[PDB]
Write a protein that binds this ligand. Structure first.
Ligand SMILES: Nc1ncnc2c1ncn2[C@@H]1O[C@H](COP(=O)(O)OP(=O)(O)OP(O)(O)=S)[C@@H](O)[C@H]1O
Lengths: 370, 54, 98, 156, 380
């Protein structure tokens, strides 16, 4: 019945978003601007009211600035406004908001907040006092005078909540978030990794204080491809550029760098040392008690009967995850729409239990061991 | 391309591409996708469709 | 026929509109060339400024003339790169479980 | 119905019944505060930007509020540039001192200096907190008026 | 139909409020200078091949267009219009105005440091020999040529560094930059990793051409492994662009009227796999290395990382320095910050030596022994 208000508010939102002389000095500045206000690119800046620009094809001129828009806006490597009549620098153009920003700079606080955890409440406090407390309330670093910890490593079994905590820090945020999957850092060219590193972390450093999260970074040391030029003597160069990027020079900035791995053994000891990463964080599969909290949260907004005990789903399997319990919930929903019911009963949980423990955790064809 | 009557887009062999107009001398069937066409110097508007050559 | 010097009028430029900006101003990448903030006419529509649309741009003063139709077809281009076997239900007989 | 009355008589040519009549909003919709972001900054009757500048106020002050202090922090009239640090540092009772040193970047008038001092003071439906800032709403005046400026006793 | 009602009609009241506002809506700084600068000139810049004899008769390609025989305007310095010197040329008359400094690179000017980080020699404690020899190499001849030239001896142009990761190569390099008094230049060793062939040659070119113009400058290389280890030979053609980049760096480094007044500090974490062409001296003289903090230099690093925090005065430092023989100053920094964070976990304001106990017995156990995990006795 809530479709009425949904559609009406959506249409009102769109129409009010689509709702977007007196000044003669501004019109005189308009008339100092050309009618074909051309666009160019800077090379260098000379103090004598004019600098050197470059055209599209490569003509270059000493052209002056319409000085009501500031030249401190101008940096080498910017797109400007040029004239046709003396080609003079007209003004500042809004920058090329490149697809690195539109892909990586996630504007959205994604999903549920710290009430979507399971088996947490120490590591939440670690990532809180290591990222949020340097971000939101760093008055205690006045009170003592100590550096904040720098790097964070999330490691454990697959399906533990690396993804979940990454979405959690991006939920409660006030800084620009960046996300990289660690398998992207090999391309079909010679020397494309360091270019990615430099432009990525330059865009990270240019806007604001920020958070860079990279995940499955272990996919660069123990992975080979036929889609690879050079090879290990370019993987090492990619690693070495990121090595100089992370623990380099020149006051790196308020950019919290957070990493997340499945395995930990195949990683550079020069990259887990502090200076780079100060807060290594264990993710074990925590306890058989907060299994019930994940069953509670992942069934907090679905109608279900009583009909089950979670102790029946505690004494079934020895390794525990949200990847277990959410799979149980989704397969229970599949068995529910399979039998066109609601208020999910026990037999859906039992068949879902067996089919999820089989698919997948067994290892390996019999036998072995048994 | 052909927008409509008395208006089309042709790419001349200067490499560039022009919003132009067509004449009523051209029979409108000889546009089909792609014809060798004739233009003007100053105004650079279509004058004629050529027989298959080039 | 005396009014055929309308056809003797100077040509025009086909370009690429990224997106508009403030004070009734727009942007055009022409055919080989860079970006040119160009001025709007009166008989045109700012409310039809689409991302990546060809428009008729005059050549002398770089004033907008008209909207050019039939823009790009990019997904159609990748589809024609593919040429997958287009199908329906009547041909995958012998099995219906999957 | 009085909010669409607010919509129509908000457009009244006398521009001080605009000030208090539009200023009623932080009293009215104080609980459903997600609608409380409005386009008062997108309007031009500069006292209206003052009204939204009041309407944020002092509670805990989320990132959207400080984001509105991104633009409201930067204005040139000394009563409105005066008007921003008061509710700006009421809404937060570096981080906290970062907009303060940003105000040092704004000026470095005397009013602005006084406003900065007020902001520093701020940095460090119960009716008792509802009265004294509506008592403060005629601030564009003498220091004789500011002799009573220290009577907005709304904090423990 | 409680929260449904709430969201639905509250957003509807919002939208209806917005509808009547959508309906209720319906310089002198330098302008005269700019109109005086329409009588200014376009001044296209160019490049010079060569002059002629007894007369200017300058031969110029612009950058792209063509090549021209031009003549200068009479407002020039008629001497300094030499070859390869980028000059501004008139549109119509093709007349030359003023030479300006040339193309540097699109993104290699962007590695001069342009600031000075506040890393100080006092923060690099425990390496007093390294401190004094680095002082002798870098700080003394570039600021006080008092003893070297006046007896007639040379200062060494080259110094190498390595050691354990976390020892202070970063500290010493940034620590010079507080008291540099020189044009310090940062060079990542991975900067020479480009796509196109022979580009690193151009990189070494423009590095040393930035080095030559401004005098008495510093260039810092860092992680010179990627610059190249050796001169491998095999029937497949592997490390080549890196190899030619490496040899061009050797040549335009030194040889055949060498560098001049530049000091280069080199660092690596694997010096054993370096070619002897870099290792032979003259190119790099003092092979200064780093060891672990073995003694009360550890306690001095404790005093550095503790002097910036209000602590309990009843504490010692040598006890934990005994408990960390092999440790690095980065690990010391992690322990000191971690104990400070333990004190901030508490609502105190001053730490304890037991907070240092927490930091030691948490870091060196949890994150020097659980990575990797043992689950087996076999040993003890
Ligand atoms: N003797 C020391 N005194 C104080 N801080 C130290 C000391 N040694 C190391 N550190 C700290 O450790 C870091 C020094 O940078 P390093 O980690 O040494 O960089 P690096 O030497 O280039 O190692 P790489 O990059 O792996 S070759 C900073 O966090 C310093 O504060």
């Amino acid at each position: 019945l809530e479709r009425i208000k949904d559609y009406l508010l959506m249409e009102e939102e769109f129409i009010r978003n689509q709702e977007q002389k007196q000044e003669e000095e501004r019109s005189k500045v308009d008339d100092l601007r050309g009618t074909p206000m051309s666009v160019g690119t800077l090379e260098e800046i000379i103090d004598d009211n004019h600098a050197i620009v470059s055209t599209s094809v490569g003509s270059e001129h000493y052209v002056s600035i319409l000085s009501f828009v500031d030249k401190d806006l101008l940096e080498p490597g910017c797109s400007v406004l040029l004239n046709h009549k003396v080609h003079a620098v007209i003004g500042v153009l809004m920058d090329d908001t490149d697809p690195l920003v539109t892909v990586m700079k996630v504007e959205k606080a994604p999903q549920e907040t710290y009430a979507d955890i399971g088996g947490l409440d120490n590591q939440i406090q670690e990532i809180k006092e290591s990222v949020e407390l340097p971000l939101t309330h760093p008055e205690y670093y006045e009170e003592m005078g100590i550096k904040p910890p720098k790097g964070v490593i999330l490691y454990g079994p697959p399906g533990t909540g690396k993804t979940l905590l990454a979405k959690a820090v991006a939920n409660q945020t006030s800084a620009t978030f960046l996300r990289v999957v660690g398998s992207e850092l090999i391309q079909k060219y010679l020397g494309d990794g360091p270019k990615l590193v430099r432009e990525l972390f330059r865009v990270a450093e240019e806007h604001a204080p920020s958070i860079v999260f990279i995940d499955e970074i272990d996919a660069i040391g123990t992975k080979r491809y036929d889609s690879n030029s050079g090879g290990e003597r370019e993987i090492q160069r990619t690693m070495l550029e990121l090595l100089n990027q992370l623990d380099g020079f020149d006051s790196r900035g308020d950019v919290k760098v957070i990493m997340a791995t499945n395995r930990i053994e195949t990683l550079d000891p020069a990259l887990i040392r502090p200076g780079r990463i100060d807060r290594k964080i264990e993710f074990p599969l925590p306890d058989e008690k907060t299994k019930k909290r994940i069953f509670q949260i992942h069934t907090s907004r679905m109608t279900l009967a009583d009909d089950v005990t979670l102790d029946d789903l505690i004494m079934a399997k020895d390794d525990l995850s949200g990847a277990d319990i959410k799979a149980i919930c989704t397969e229970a929903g599949l068995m529910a729409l399979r039998e066109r019911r609601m208020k999910v009963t026990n037999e859906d949980f039992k068949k879902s239990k067996e089919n999820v423990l089989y698919k997948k955790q067994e290892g390996t064809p019999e036998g072995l061991y048994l | 391309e052909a927008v409509d009557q008395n208006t089309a887009i042709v790419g001349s062999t200067t490499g560039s591409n022009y919003y132009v107009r067509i004449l009523s001398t051209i029979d409108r069937e000889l546009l089909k996708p792609n014809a060798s066409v004739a233009l003007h110097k100053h105004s650079n508007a279509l004058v004629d469709v050529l027989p298959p050559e080039a | 026929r005396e009014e055929l010097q309308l056809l003797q009028e100077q040509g025009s430029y086909v370009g690429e509109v990224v997106r508009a900006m403030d004070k009734k101003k727009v942007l055009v990448k022409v055919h080989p060339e860079g970006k040119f903030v160009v001025d709007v006419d009166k008989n045109i529509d700012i409310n039809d400024v689409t991302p990546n649309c060809r428009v008729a741009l005059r050549n002398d003063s770089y004033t907008l003339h008209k909207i050019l139709p039939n823009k790009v077809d990019p997904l159609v281009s990748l589809m024609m790169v593919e040429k997958v076997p287009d199908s329906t239900y009547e041909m995958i007989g012998g099995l219906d479980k999957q | 119905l009085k909010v669409q009355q607010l919509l129509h008589i908000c457009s009244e040519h006398f521009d001080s019944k605009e000030k208090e009549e539009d200023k009623d909003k932080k009293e009215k919709k104080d609980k459903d505060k997600k609608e409380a972001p409005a386009d008062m900054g997108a309007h031009q009757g500069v006292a209206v930007l003052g009204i939204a500048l009041i309407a944020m106020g002092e509670e805990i002050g989320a990132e959207m509020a400080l984001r509105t202090f991104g633009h409201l922090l930067r204005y040139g009239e000394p009563t409105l540039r005066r008007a921003v640090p008061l509710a700006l540092a009421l809404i937060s009772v570096s981080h906290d001192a970062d907009p303060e040193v940003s105000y040092n970047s704004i000026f470095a008038a005397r009013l602005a200096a006084m406003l900065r001092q007020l902001a520093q003071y701020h940095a460090k439906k119960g009716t008792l907190t509802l009265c004294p800032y509506h008592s403060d709403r005629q601030l564009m005046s003498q220091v004789a008026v500011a002799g009573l400026l220290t009577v907005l006793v709304s904090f423990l | 139909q409680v929260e449904d009602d709430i969201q639905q009609l509250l957003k509807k009241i919002n939208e209806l409020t917005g509808i009547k506002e959508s309906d209720t809506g319906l310089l002198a700084a330098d302008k005269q200078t700019l109109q005086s600068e329409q009588p200014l000139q376009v001044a296209r810049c160019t490049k010079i091949i060569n002059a002629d004899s007894e007369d200017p008769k300058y031969i110029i390609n612009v950058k792209q267009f063509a090549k021209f025989v031009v003549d200068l305007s009479d407002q020039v310095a008629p001497t300094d219009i030499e070859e390869g010197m980028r000059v501004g040329v008139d549109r119509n008359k093709y007349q030359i105005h003023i030479p300006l400094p040339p193309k540097i690179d699109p993104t290699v000017t962007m590695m001069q440091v342009e600031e000075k980080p506040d890393v100080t020699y006092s923060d690099v404690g425990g390496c007093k020999e390294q401190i004094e020899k680095l002082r002798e190499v870098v700080e003394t001849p570039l600021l006080h040529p008092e003893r070297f030239v006046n007896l007639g001896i040379e200062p060494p142009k080259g110094v190498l560094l390595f050691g354990p990761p976390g020892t202070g190569k970063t500290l010493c390099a940034r620590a010079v930059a507080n008291r540099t008094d020189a044009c310090f230049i940062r060079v990542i060793g991975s900067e020479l990793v480009q796509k196109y062939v022979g580009e690193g040659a151009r990189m070494v070119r423009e590095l040393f051409e930035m080095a030559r113009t401004k005098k008495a400058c510093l260039i810092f290389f860092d992680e010179i492994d990627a610059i190249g280890g050796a001169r491998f030979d095999d029937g497949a053609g592997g490390d080549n662009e890196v190899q030619r980049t490496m040899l061009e760096l050797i040549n335009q480094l030194d040889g055949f009227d060498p560098r001049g007044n530049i000091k280069v500090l080199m660092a690596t974490n694997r010096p054993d796999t370096l070619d002897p062409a870099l290792m032979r001296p003259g190119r790099l003289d003092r092979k200064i290395e780093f060891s672990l903090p073995d003694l009360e230099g550890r306690t001095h690093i404790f005093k550095i990382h503790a002097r910036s925090m209000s602590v309990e005065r009843d504490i010692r430092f040598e006890l934990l320095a005994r408990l960390c023989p092999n440790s690095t100053g980065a690990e010391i920094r992690s322990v000191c910050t971690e104990a400070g964070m333990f004190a901030i976990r508490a609502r105190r304001k001053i730490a304890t030596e037991k907070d240092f106990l927490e930091a030691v017995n948490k870091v060196i156990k949890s994150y020097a022994k659980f990575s990797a995990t043992p689950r087996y006795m076999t040993y003890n």
